[PDB]
């Protein structure tokens, strides 16, 4: 699926991304935009072995498992197929786990290159929800 962005940001809504760990719904609409251009099918292979998937390329060393990445963790507990599917859930629920590290948001580097810091307000005008 590739998501407008409107419909993306009632999505996240839905699911609680708002002000979620003091994360507005506009840094979570930005770094997805940064990062998969909004396409819920994105992959992205990393010389290391590791592939960063789905709607917020979640990696395959950490959180998910891939069969292929060795000596990895999967600490969302999930295959790494199911950040493919349309729906965001999966990727939503493998995020939240994510963002109440300690890092927060620092995890992906397309929000911290082009989101952090800016009026990520702008990510969520012009919608309904």
Known sequence: ?????????????????????????????????????????????????????????????????????????NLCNIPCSALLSSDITASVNCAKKIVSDGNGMNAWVAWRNRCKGTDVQAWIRGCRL
């Open 1 to 73: 699926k590739v998501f407008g962005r409107c419909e993306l940001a009632a999505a996240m809504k839905r699911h609680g991304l708002d002000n979620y760990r003091g994360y507005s719904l506009g840094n979570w609409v930005c770094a997805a935009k940064f990062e998969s251009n909004f396409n819920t099918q994105a992959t992205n292979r990393n010389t290391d072995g590791s592939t960063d998937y789905g709607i917020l390329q979640i990696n395959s060393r950490w959180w998910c498992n891939d069969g292929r990445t060795p000596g990895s963790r």
